[PDB]
Design a binder for this molecule. Structure first.
Ligand SMILES: N[C@@H](CCC(=O)N[C@@H](CS)C(=O)NCC(=O)O)C(=O)O
Ligand SMILES: N[C@@H](CCC(=O)N[C@@H](CS)C(=O)NCC(=O)O)C(=O)O
Ligand SMILES: [Ca+2]
Ligand SMILES: [Ca+2]
Ligand SMILES: [Ca+2]
Ligand SMILES: [Ca+2]
Lengths: 217, 217
């Protein structure tokens, strides 16, 4: 039960979508993110799924729980075991209204990793293409985006999901969509994704945007 | 945050493992499996995680539950919502002792899908390489392997995980290891994987092996 993609998007679930990855020259992040790819456990945890993909990909030290002990890994359930994390915003609130861009950043920063929040309002499409594309060539850092689905031709509201690769020939980014029951990963034209982050989240009264994540040293 | 690999195995989490994928001509399965890649929810559910990766990739009509409704998708928690699945072996039993190859086959078949169970004792490495390598070239069917982790230099017992791709130059198979907190995906020599399948499961007193899955056309 997958939803159908608007003509403007190229699904990863297609030959075209696979070739956009095999031809892309900015994709170093796809392999680790794919290894950690996860379904948001409820329809408002897209930010939590996205964070744990990134933190697990960065290999930073993970929570110690009964679940997988002795093994340690970020999961959507144990992400909030960090008291500074709940302090930002409680899990039962995220389970209702999700998380804003600034909150996403603080929730990542609660685990001591380096974050840079970019509101669409404080930048422009060129430095986003330039900077994001650069990140996608490098290990040890990642990109998460927060965007209004409606503006790239999907249903519907604000979403969060990491990016895995950029296709230089088509000017499209690959979104590793954590709503896996709903949409496959899609290749979205920078034009559409920009429009999509350049939207005001009523919750924050601030624009959506994108966040760079890396380790502090 | 995983265990270190034995030298005989090339992790997907390396340059070597990444290009073993890019230079394989038997990999059509990797893309849809990668999109469904999950962590087994407890340390005995590797069979259940493997099945749902395959059923979700096959676009088998999925359970209808509250969790993701209106969207329909296989999860480890809703796989046993089908009464004939539970009849094969109860979730509470799988959660303790996992599943044998034979039970793996019957659990898949309980969803009306076409399954061919191959115990190692009734075939041989050469027809395993040939038939799996060709399944990895075709859409609409998938391969799950059951194997003793020791025989490939991993810790430790019988495991289950789907196969994504076969790299002809090296004669290695990519295991999409659902124990994601413990090991990354690994490229394992065909000979090594045969050794591991050709072992007797004390639970079944039968050899381990591999399973082909497809839609009932
Ligand atoms: N207020 C943020 C919320 C971002 C967010 O967390 N969205 C959640 C729902 S509140 C999600 O998981 N959505 C899945 C989807 O859009 O399909 C926004 O509008 O951008
Ligand atoms: N009895 C089967 C069990 C296969 C199985 O279900 N393994 C479970 C444990 S009982 C598992 O999830 N193992 C994870 C791992 O070995 O990494 C065998 O030995 O092959
Ligand atoms: Ca790398
Ligand atoms: Ca990067
Ligand atoms: Ca295909
Ligand atoms: Ca196949």
């Amino acid at each position: 039960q997958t939803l159908t993609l608007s003509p403007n998007l190229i699904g990863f679930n297609s030959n075209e979508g696979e070739k956009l990855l095999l031809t892309s020259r900015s994709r170093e992040d796809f392999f680790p993110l794919s290894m950690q790819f996860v379904t948001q456990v409820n329809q408002a945890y897209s930010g939590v799924a996205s964070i744990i993909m990134v933190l697990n990909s960065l290999g930073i030290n993970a929570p110690e729980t009964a679940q997988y002990s002795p093994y340690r890994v970020f999961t959507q359930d144990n992400f909030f075991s960090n008291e500074k994390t709940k302090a930002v915003i409680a899990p039962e609130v995220v389970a209702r209204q999700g998380m804003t861009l600034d909150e996403l950043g603080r929730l990542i920063a609660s685990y001591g990793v380096k974050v840079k929040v970019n509101h669409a309002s404080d930048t422009n499409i060129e430095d986003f293409r330039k900077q994001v594309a650069e990140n996608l060539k490098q290990d040890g850092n990642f990109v998460i985006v927060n965007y209004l689905r409606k503006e790239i031709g999907q249903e519907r509201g604000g979403h969060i999901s990491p990016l895995a690769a950029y296709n230089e020939q088509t000017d499209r980014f690959l979104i590793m969509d954590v709503s896996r029951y709903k949409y496959p990963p899609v290749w979205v034209k920078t034009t559409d994704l920009w429009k999509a982050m350049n939207t005001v989240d009523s919750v924050s009264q601030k624009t959506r945007g994108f966040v760079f994540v890396s380790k502090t040293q």
